[model samples]
Target: PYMTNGIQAAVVEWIRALDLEIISLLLSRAWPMALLATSELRWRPTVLTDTDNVVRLDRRQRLVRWDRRPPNEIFLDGFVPIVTRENPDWEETDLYGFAKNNHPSIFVSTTKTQRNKKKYVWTPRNANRGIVYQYEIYAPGGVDVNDSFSDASPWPNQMQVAFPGGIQNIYIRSARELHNGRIQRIWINPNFLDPGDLEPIVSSSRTPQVIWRMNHPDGGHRDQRDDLMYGGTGNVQEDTFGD
Candidate 1:
């Protein structure tokens, strides 16, 4: 009975989720068919929007919240706890999961199509799909990738890179370690690129001329490698993943 809360597409009856704040979210997007057809099988909750808070109900009219995120949180600008079995006194059990490897999502461009309707474009979970779609942000040419960039980070150890041409998406180049998301190299969606994410264009002996900072991509998540390891002593050569 451990509920993993997340955005689902099925009709929802999260008896505990109508937290007023969330009700407003649905009021705009959800068109209740007199509460009849809306809850019927004729339509599914348009937990629409490729990137939005997805949730729903079932034909039984029970709010069926679902999505393959975390087992204990929800993505509200960031992951926050919605429900938890750990707290026996709490409610809102429907909201149990959220984006774990959350955020860091890369914003890829929209694709072209002719059978389009309502908007310029359109758009995810299953019995929990094991394969998650992700965007790749990288540098072309001899860029060893692994030691050049990674998903966006807060430490600003990594900086955004500009392509010589074309702009389908943005890129993040890893400069130091730890904050690099432990990816030998990483890419991301434009949404993940924050306004304060870029670095000042400067000179560096380590690599090429780019508008950013950081040492290398492969620099262990905990050890800055040559850029100067944090706390002095830690074998970065073996550190693969990040926290």
Candidate 2:
């Protein structure tokens, strides 16, 4: 009969809760008695007095609480939650990402002639600080040229163009930080020989499906070449720009 009280009784209870194999292993060691004599073990039970708060181990093995308040006072973090309706059929679908609020206006125009010219104008209303633009273009038939600049010189500004109603995804960004009240301009032109045959129709929903504006008040523009190098996401060939 092991008779104990107070701290010794608590120690005995804690030891009993441990695995039998661990207890046996500890008992088999010659230094077990020495360890038990010298060790100063302390156990404190965690108490959650409030119903609104709860504590749990996080992924980093840190003890965190559910109702912990944020550190910053303004709560003006750069990243904000953004949701997209990629699929309309599915109910209660949730996807989140860091997105800005400054939305751009897209304009589409088509020429009425044998050599038809379809142009897409993307104007950023509040991108004076600088911005990263990304978009996807779908043409029913292969277009003659797809670029931000003019059709004659389409080397650096040439975007990805797919043939036979394929989708072409492109990313365009400012190379340097913009000054105050200076808005960026992006032009997309697709030429066609026939008026009705393979005429381009720009999607009016949103130009540049995703946009990331540089830190406001200060400056740091997102360069297009740098974004492509860091796996930003685009189909345009690097060699086409002579890079």
Candidate 3:
């Protein structure tokens, strides 16, 4: 039988008690850092703990509103960036290497045509029209897509990656280690999904009706019973995969 750590075991036990589906748990080891979103840079240590407390303490620390003793300090050697949300000259680096990159993801809530106005405690920047999903590289100088260890100076063990929308985050583990250190493993906690999982497609005949037309080829619509059971509009159509 496989044995889990205390935390993992406890959570699994709790889920069993609650009669909830047991989703597979993901595990990875990576240096943690405090991140400020306005600038995609990490600002603090990646403390090891449960998400609830980690997130809660981060909020209190950022807001300077902690009334009780601060969370136990795990004090791991990690990188910290100086930039904050207050900086006006903020620029998000396009590490993804997309065409005309550095575009910010927009957040429209309450039909305000703006990002979330009310910022959460730890989250400094909201994804408004101009705000971008900018990020900063935490390597010694910076993160270069084409970087290698042979460069002037070697990169550090810990690197920080930040996000713009409180919604979108990414963590990276490079297959190639440029520095002298051997990358046993890399852990990241980004809010965004993988790009390969998120791609857009556009087609006119790609609607539900299109599926029926192609499958039937007899020019007859799908039966009402099947439609009723599936609960879908026969004319259903989506502009694209962003669909």
Candidate 4:
């Protein structure tokens, strides 16, 4: 009865995979246990957040070995094998997944010189979410000192700007994701005017002023249009929802 043994073994493996023993014991004498079991069987997305938890695998996919050094840490030692009916000798592939926190935890700092030159830097702590997608610097009437002053380009985290005429305020914006799976457009305001400084008696109103303004590679808004082209027609129409 080899076929009967195989079927019985498969059934046992399926039950073990579901870990139904604990559920069965919990509802041993209950008549409505079926409904409870069905409810418990419902699947939901698991969100990992820098914690240690035992992950399960199918019977065909094995967990060779793992190392644990308390305080919620695990390292898989060996690769697990996968079995298939068509090809029993299927290649053993490594399954990779992100278990660490994907939230954006970042910091920013600024430095200025007596020559009216300013530098701003943004640093991200977590490498998983440290990737900077886009940034914008708002100087208003002031000018940028560097050649790379675009919102989409040459790394906006660290950049310098020079203001010939004293500036009152500077605004910066960055796009990033938060810990709660929500995307946030962060806005930062830096003070440029010194309130405590006393005015000099001998001040020249007319001084040779030079402010730098760099052109974006994509030409900014001129290249990126929100208008949609009509079906099969060459004419372009503005998007009503864009406003």
- Model 2 ranges off by over 4 Å: 1-124, 132-138, 141-167, 170-243
lDDT of 2 by residue, 16-83 (tens): 34453333233223323443354321111122111123331111111100001111100112111111
What's the distance in Å from true for residue 113, model 3?
A: 36
Off by over 4 Å in 1: 1-182, 197-243
lDDT of 2 at 155: 27
Better of 2 and 3 by TM-score: 2
TM-score of each model, paired residue for residue: 0.16, 0.16, 0.15, 0.15
Please give, for residues 135-212, the per-residue lDDT of candidate 1 as tens digits.
222222110111122221111111111111112122222221112232122222223233342323222354333222
In model 4, what are the clashing residue pairs, if there are any? none
Per-residue lDDT of candidate 3, residues 96-165 (tens digit): 2110122331100000001123212111111111211111111111111111111211111111122211
User: What TM-score should be assigned to candidate 4?
Assistant: 0.15
Under the 3 Å rule for N, CA and C atoms, how many clashes does model 1 have? Answer: 31
TM-score attained by model 2:
0.16
Task: Provide C-alpha RMSD values for all models, in order.
Answer: 20.6, 29.3, 23.5, 27.8
